[PDB]
């Protein structure tokens, strides 16, 4: 009886706590909100920053490279930044990030420092 599965997509559930004083310290970037004809490697959304000290950084679970696929299960393909804004704002203090992991990753390098 294998461990295992049929190898479909993955996702994870990142839940982050703050309090009304202070603030969801991570930044999304990328969008490339034009339609490619062919299948590129590529992410509307990601983690590009997370400031120091955060309730993000200590999730201990979510950094800089985080592929993003839905926002309190809602997903934040097709809705305006506007939306996505108002959607982590009305989750308060606790935020749920529906992203996607990986187990296929190993060393990128590059003539670079990200």
Known sequence: ???????????????????????????????????????TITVPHKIGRIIDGS??????????????????????????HADIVKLIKDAGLSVTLRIIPQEELNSPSGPSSG
């Open 55 to 80: 309730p993000a950084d200590r999730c201990a679970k979510l950094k800089v490279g985080d592929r993003i696929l839905a926002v309190n299960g809602q997903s934040i393909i097709n809705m305006p």
């Open 1 to 39: 009886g294998s461990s295992g599965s049929s190898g479909s997509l993955q996702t994870s559930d990142v839940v982050i706590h703050r309090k009304e004083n202070e603030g969801f310290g991570f930044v999304i970037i990328s969008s490339l909100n034009r339609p490619e004809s062919g299948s």
